[PDB]
Amino acid sequence: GKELVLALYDYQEKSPREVTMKKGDILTLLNSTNKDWWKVEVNDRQGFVPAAYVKKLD
């Protein structure tokens, strides 16, 4: 569908654009385009997460 990632480590936002996510989470990755702050659909929000702490499922 979109892209998906397995969360390798947790993360907690530092900004309204960033969102929190938890280690193990199958996130729905929305924009890998940014390279570094990848945008994903997570919980209820289309927010930024560190590209570091995620691994492409697809």
Coordinates of all heavy atoms in Angstrom, one line a residue:
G1 N 0.9 -1.2 0.0 CA 0.0 0.0 0.0 C 0.9 1.2 0.0 O 1.4 1.6 -1.0
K2 N 1.1 1.8 1.2 CA 2.1 2.8 1.4 C 3.5 2.1 1.5 O 3.7 1.1 0.8 CB 1.7 3.7 2.6 CG 0.4 4.3 2.4 CD -0.1 5.1 3.7 CE -1.5 5.7 3.5 NZ -1.9 6.4 4.7
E3 N 4.3 2.5 2.4 CA 5.5 1.8 2.8 C 5.3 1.3 4.2 O 4.4 1.9 4.9 CB 6.7 2.7 2.7 CG 7.0 3.3 1.3 CD 8.1 4.3 1.4 OE1 9.3 4.0 1.3 OE2 7.7 5.5 1.4
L4 N 6.0 0.4 4.7 CA 5.9 0.0 6.1 C 7.3 -0.2 6.7 O 8.3 -0.6 6.0 CB 5.1 -1.3 6.3 CG 3.6 -1.1 6.0 CD1 3.2 -1.3 4.6 CD2 2.8 -2.0 6.9
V5 N 7.5 0.0 8.0 CA 8.7 -0.2 8.7 C 8.5 -0.9 10.0 O 7.4 -0.6 10.7 CB 9.5 1.1 8.9 CG1 9.9 1.8 7.6 CG2 8.7 2.2 9.7
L6 N 9.4 -1.7 10.5 CA 9.5 -2.2 11.8 C 10.3 -1.2 12.6 O 11.4 -0.8 12.2 CB 10.2 -3.6 11.8 CG 10.0 -4.5 12.9 CD1 10.5 -4.0 14.3 CD2 8.6 -5.0 13.1
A7 N 9.9 -0.8 13.8 CA 10.6 0.2 14.6 C 11.7 -0.6 15.4 O 11.4 -1.5 16.2 CB 9.6 0.9 15.6
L8 N 12.9 -0.2 15.2 CA 14.1 -0.9 15.7 C 14.2 -0.4 17.2 O 14.5 -1.3 18.0 CB 15.3 -0.5 15.0 CG 15.3 -1.0 13.5 CD1 16.6 -0.4 12.8 CD2 15.3 -2.5 13.4
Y9 N 14.0 0.9 17.5 CA 14.1 1.4 18.8 C 12.9 2.4 18.9 O 12.2 2.7 17.9 CB 15.4 2.2 19.0 CG 16.6 1.2 18.9 CD1 17.3 1.1 17.7 CD2 16.8 0.3 20.0 CE1 18.3 0.1 17.6 CE2 17.8 -0.7 19.8 CZ 18.5 -0.8 18.7 OH 19.5 -1.7 18.5
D10 N 12.5 2.8 20.2 CA 11.4 3.7 20.4 C 11.9 5.1 20.0 O 13.0 5.3 19.7 CB 11.1 3.7 21.9 CG 10.8 2.4 22.6 OD1 11.8 1.8 23.1 OD2 9.7 2.0 22.7
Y11 N 10.9 6.0 19.9 CA 11.3 7.4 19.8 C 10.2 8.3 20.4 O 9.0 7.9 20.4 CB 11.4 7.8 18.3 CG 11.7 9.3 18.2 CD1 13.0 9.8 18.6 CD2 10.8 10.2 17.7 CE1 13.2 11.2 18.6 CE2 11.0 11.6 17.6 CZ 12.2 12.1 18.1 OH 12.5 13.4 18.1
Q12 N 10.5 9.4 21.0 CA 9.6 10.4 21.5 C 9.9 11.8 20.9 O 11.0 12.2 20.8 CB 9.8 10.5 23.0 CG 8.8 11.5 23.7 CD 9.0 11.4 25.3 OE1 9.9 10.7 25.8 NE2 8.2 12.2 26.0
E13 N 8.8 12.4 20.4 CA 8.8 13.7 19.7 C 9.5 14.8 20.5 O 9.5 14.7 21.7 CB 7.4 14.1 19.4 CG 6.4 14.1 20.6 CD 6.6 15.4 21.5 OE1 6.6 16.5 20.9 OE2 6.7 15.3 22.7
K14 N 10.0 15.8 19.8 CA 10.5 17.0 20.4 C 9.8 18.2 19.7 O 10.3 19.3 19.8 CB 12.0 17.1 20.1 CG 12.8 15.9 20.4 CD 14.3 16.0 20.1 CE 14.6 16.5 18.7 NZ 14.0 15.7 17.6
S15 N 8.7 18.0 19.0 CA 8.1 19.0 18.2 C 6.7 18.5 17.8 O 6.5 17.3 17.6 CB 9.0 19.3 17.0 OG 9.2 18.1 16.3
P16 N 5.8 19.4 17.5 CA 4.4 19.1 17.0 C 4.5 18.3 15.7 O 3.6 17.6 15.3 CB 3.7 20.4 16.9 CG 4.8 21.4 16.7 CD 5.9 20.9 17.5
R17 N 5.6 18.5 14.9 CA 5.7 17.7 13.6 C 6.2 16.3 13.9 O 5.8 15.4 13.1 CB 6.6 18.5 12.7 CG 8.1 18.3 13.1 CD 9.1 19.1 12.2 NE 10.5 18.7 12.5 CZ 11.1 17.6 12.0 NH1 10.4 16.9 11.1 NH2 12.3 17.3 12.3
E18 N 7.0 16.1 14.9 CA 7.4 14.8 15.3 C 6.3 14.1 16.1 O 5.5 14.8 16.7 CB 8.7 14.9 16.1 CG 9.9 15.2 15.3 CD 11.1 15.7 16.1 OE1 11.1 15.5 17.3 OE2 12.1 16.2 15.5
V19 N 6.3 12.8 16.1 CA 5.4 12.0 16.9 C 6.1 10.9 17.6 O 7.2 10.5 17.1 CB 4.2 11.4 16.0 CG1 3.3 12.5 15.6 CG2 4.7 10.6 14.8
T20 N 5.6 10.4 18.7 CA 6.2 9.3 19.5 C 5.8 8.0 18.8 O 4.7 7.8 18.2 CB 5.6 9.5 20.9 OG1 6.1 10.7 21.3 CG2 6.0 8.4 21.9
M21 N 6.7 7.0 18.9 CA 6.4 5.6 18.5 C 7.2 4.6 19.4 O 8.1 5.1 20.1 CB 6.7 5.4 17.0 CG 8.1 5.6 16.6 SD 9.3 4.3 16.9 CE 10.7 4.8 15.9
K22 N 6.9 3.4 19.4 CA 7.5 2.4 20.3 C 8.2 1.3 19.6 O 7.9 0.9 18.4 CB 6.4 1.8 21.2 CG 5.6 3.0 22.0 CD 6.5 3.8 22.9 CE 6.8 3.2 24.3 NZ 7.5 1.9 24.3
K23 N 9.2 0.7 20.2 CA 10.1 -0.3 19.6 C 9.2 -1.5 19.3 O 8.4 -1.9 20.2 CB 11.2 -0.6 20.7 CG 12.3 -1.5 20.1 CD 12.0 -3.0 20.3 CE 13.3 -3.8 19.9 NZ 13.6 -3.8 18.5
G24 N 9.4 -2.1 18.1 CA 8.7 -3.2 17.7 C 7.5 -2.8 16.7 O 7.1 -3.6 15.9
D25 N 7.0 -1.6 16.8 CA 5.9 -1.1 16.1 C 6.0 -1.3 14.6 O 7.1 -0.9 14.0 CB 5.6 0.4 16.4 CG 5.0 0.6 17.8 OD1 4.7 -0.4 18.5 OD2 4.8 1.8 18.1
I26 N 5.0 -1.9 14.0 CA 4.9 -1.9 12.5 C 4.2 -0.6 12.2 O 3.0 -0.4 12.3 CB 4.1 -3.1 12.1 CG1 4.9 -4.4 12.4 CG2 3.7 -3.0 10.6 CD1 4.1 -5.7 12.2
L27 N 5.0 0.4 11.8 CA 4.5 1.7 11.4 C 4.2 1.7 9.9 O 4.7 0.9 9.1 CB 5.6 2.8 11.7 CG 6.2 2.7 13.1 CD1 7.4 3.6 13.2 CD2 5.2 3.1 14.1
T28 N 3.4 2.7 9.4 CA 3.0 2.8 8.0 C 3.8 4.0 7.5 O 3.4 5.1 7.8 CB 1.5 3.0 7.9 OG1 0.8 2.0 8.7 CG2 1.1 2.9 6.5
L29 N 4.9 3.8 6.8 CA 5.8 4.8 6.4 C 5.2 5.5 5.2 O 4.7 4.9 4.3 CB 7.1 4.2 6.1 CG 8.1 5.0 5.3 CD1 8.6 6.2 5.9 CD2 9.4 4.1 5.0
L30 N 5.1 6.9 5.3 CA 4.3 7.7 4.4 C 5.3 8.4 3.4 O 5.0 8.5 2.2 CB 3.4 8.7 5.2 CG 2.6 9.6 4.3 CD1 1.6 8.8 3.4 CD2 1.8 10.5 5.2
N31 N 6.3 9.1 3.9 CA 7.3 9.8 3.1 C 8.7 9.4 3.6 O 9.2 9.9 4.6 CB 7.1 11.3 3.2 CG 6.3 11.9 2.0 OD1 6.5 13.0 1.6 ND2 5.2 11.2 1.6
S32 N 9.4 8.6 2.9 CA 10.8 8.3 3.0 C 11.6 9.4 2.4 O 12.8 9.5 2.6 CB 11.1 6.9 2.5 OG 10.4 6.7 1.2
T33 N 11.0 10.1 1.5 CA 11.6 11.2 0.7 C 12.6 12.1 1.4 O 13.6 12.5 0.9 CB 10.4 12.0 0.1 OG1 9.4 12.1 1.1 CG2 9.8 11.3 -1.1
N34 N 12.3 12.3 2.7 CA 13.1 13.3 3.5 C 14.4 12.7 3.9 O 15.3 13.5 4.4 CB 12.4 13.7 4.8 CG 10.9 13.9 4.7 OD1 10.5 15.0 4.5 ND2 10.1 12.8 4.9
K35 N 14.7 11.4 3.7 CA 15.9 10.7 4.0 C 16.0 10.5 5.5 O 16.3 9.4 5.9 CB 17.1 11.4 3.4 CG 18.3 10.4 3.3 CD 19.5 10.9 2.6 CE 20.1 12.2 3.2 NZ 20.5 12.0 4.6
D36 N 15.9 11.5 6.3 CA 16.3 11.5 7.7 C 15.2 11.6 8.7 O 15.0 10.7 9.5 CB 17.4 12.6 8.0 CG 18.6 12.4 7.1 OD1 19.2 11.4 7.0 OD2 18.8 13.4 6.3
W37 N 14.3 12.6 8.6 CA 13.1 12.5 9.3 C 12.0 11.9 8.4 O 11.5 12.6 7.6 CB 12.7 13.9 9.8 CG 13.5 14.3 11.0 CD1 14.5 15.2 11.0 CD2 13.4 13.9 12.4 NE1 15.1 15.2 12.2 CE2 14.5 14.4 13.1 CE3 12.5 13.0 13.1 CZ2 14.7 14.1 14.5 CZ3 12.7 12.7 14.5 CH2 13.9 13.3 15.1
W38 N 11.8 10.6 8.5 CA 10.8 10.0 7.6 C 9.4 10.3 8.2 O 9.3 10.3 9.5 CB 11.0 8.5 7.6 CG 12.2 8.0 6.7 CD1 13.0 8.8 5.9 CD2 12.6 6.7 6.4 NE1 13.8 8.0 5.2 CE2 13.6 6.7 5.5 CE3 12.2 5.4 6.9 CZ2 14.3 5.5 5.0 CZ3 12.8 4.2 6.5 CH2 13.9 4.3 5.5
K39 N 8.4 10.6 7.4 CA 7.0 10.8 7.9 C 6.3 9.5 7.8 O 6.4 8.8 6.8 CB 6.3 11.8 7.0 CG 5.3 12.6 7.7 CD 4.6 13.6 6.8 CE 3.5 14.4 7.6 NZ 2.8 15.4 6.7
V40 N 5.6 9.1 8.9 CA 4.8 7.9 8.9 C 3.4 8.2 9.5 O 3.3 9.2 10.2 CB 5.5 6.8 9.7 CG1 7.1 6.8 9.5 CG2 5.3 6.8 11.1
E41 N 2.5 7.4 9.1 CA 1.1 7.3 9.7 C 1.2 6.3 10.9 O 1.6 5.2 10.7 CB 0.2 6.9 8.6 CG -1.3 6.8 9.1 CD -2.2 6.7 7.9 OE1 -2.2 5.6 7.3 OE2 -2.8 7.7 7.5
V42 N 1.1 6.9 12.1 CA 1.3 6.2 13.4 C 0.2 6.6 14.4 O -0.1 7.8 14.6 CB 2.7 6.4 13.9 CG1 3.1 7.9 13.8 CG2 2.9 6.0 15.3
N43 N -0.5 5.6 15.0 CA -1.5 5.7 15.9 C -2.7 6.4 15.4 O -3.8 5.8 15.1 CB -1.0 6.3 17.3 CG -2.2 6.3 18.3 OD1 -2.3 5.3 19.0 ND2 -2.9 7.3 18.4
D44 N -2.7 7.7 15.2 CA -3.7 8.6 14.8 C -3.2 9.8 14.0 O -3.9 10.8 13.8 CB -4.5 9.1 16.0 CG -3.7 10.1 16.7 OD1 -2.6 9.9 17.1 OD2 -4.3 11.2 17.0
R45 N -1.9 9.8 13.6 CA -1.2 11.0 13.2 C -0.2 10.7 12.1 O 0.4 9.6 12.2 CB -0.5 11.6 14.5 CG -0.4 13.1 14.6 CD -1.8 13.7 14.9 NE -2.4 13.2 16.1 CZ -2.0 13.4 17.4 NH1 -1.0 14.2 17.6 NH2 -2.6 12.8 18.4
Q46 N -0.1 11.6 11.2 CA 0.9 11.5 10.1 C 2.1 12.4 10.5 O 2.0 13.6 10.3 CB 0.3 11.9 8.8 CG -0.8 11.0 8.3 CD -2.1 11.1 9.0 OE1 -2.4 12.1 9.7 NE2 -3.0 10.1 9.0
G47 N 3.1 11.8 11.2 CA 4.1 12.6 11.9 C 5.5 12.1 11.6 O 5.6 11.1 10.9
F48 N 6.5 12.9 12.0 CA 7.9 12.5 11.7 C 8.5 11.6 12.7 O 8.2 11.8 13.9 CB 8.7 13.8 11.5 CG 8.4 14.5 10.2 CD1 7.6 15.7 10.2 CD2 8.9 14.0 9.0 CE1 7.3 16.3 9.0 CE2 8.6 14.7 7.8 CZ 7.8 15.8 7.8
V49 N 9.3 10.6 12.3 CA 10.1 9.7 13.1 C 11.5 9.7 12.6 O 11.8 10.0 11.4 CB 9.5 8.3 13.1 CG1 8.0 8.4 13.3 CG2 9.8 7.5 11.9
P50 N 12.6 9.4 13.4 CA 13.9 9.2 13.0 C 14.0 8.0 12.0 O 13.6 6.9 12.3 CB 14.8 8.9 14.2 CG 13.9 9.4 15.4 CD 12.5 9.2 14.9
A51 N 14.6 8.3 10.8 CA 14.9 7.2 9.9 C 15.8 6.2 10.5 O 15.9 5.0 10.0 CB 15.4 7.8 8.6
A52 N 16.7 6.6 11.4 CA 17.6 5.7 12.1 C 17.0 4.5 12.7 O 17.4 3.4 12.5 CB 18.4 6.5 13.2
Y53 N 15.9 4.7 13.4 CA 15.3 3.6 14.3 C 14.2 2.9 13.6 O 13.3 2.4 14.3 CB 14.8 4.3 15.6 CG 15.8 5.2 16.3 CD1 15.2 6.3 17.0 CD2 17.2 5.0 16.3 CE1 16.1 7.2 17.6 CE2 18.0 5.9 16.9 CZ 17.5 7.0 17.6 OH 18.3 7.8 18.3
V54 N 14.3 2.7 12.3 CA 13.2 2.0 11.6 C 13.9 1.1 10.6 O 15.1 1.4 10.2 CB 12.2 3.0 10.9 CG1 11.3 3.6 12.0 CG2 12.9 4.1 10.2
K55 N 13.3 0.0 10.1 CA 13.7 -0.9 9.1 C 12.6 -1.2 8.1 O 11.6 -1.7 8.6 CB 14.3 -2.2 9.8 CG 14.7 -3.3 8.8 CD 15.7 -2.8 7.7 CE 17.0 -2.1 8.3 NZ 17.8 -2.9 9.2
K56 N 12.8 -1.0 6.9 CA 11.8 -1.2 5.8 C 11.3 -2.7 5.8 O 12.1 -3.6 5.6 CB 12.5 -0.9 4.4 CG 12.6 0.6 4.2 CD 11.3 1.2 3.7 CE 11.1 1.0 2.2 NZ 9.8 1.4 1.7
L57 N 10.0 -2.8 6.1 CA 9.3 -4.0 5.8 C 9.0 -4.0 4.3 O 9.2 -5.1 3.7 CB 8.0 -4.1 6.6 CG 8.3 -4.2 8.1 CD1 7.0 -3.9 8.9 CD2 8.7 -5.7 8.4
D58 N 8.6 -2.9 3.7 CA 8.4 -2.8 2.3 C 8.3 -1.3 1.9 O 8.1 -0.5 2.9 CB 7.1 -3.5 1.8 CG 5.8 -3.0 2.4 OD1 5.6 -3.6 3.5 OD2 5.1 -2.2 1.8

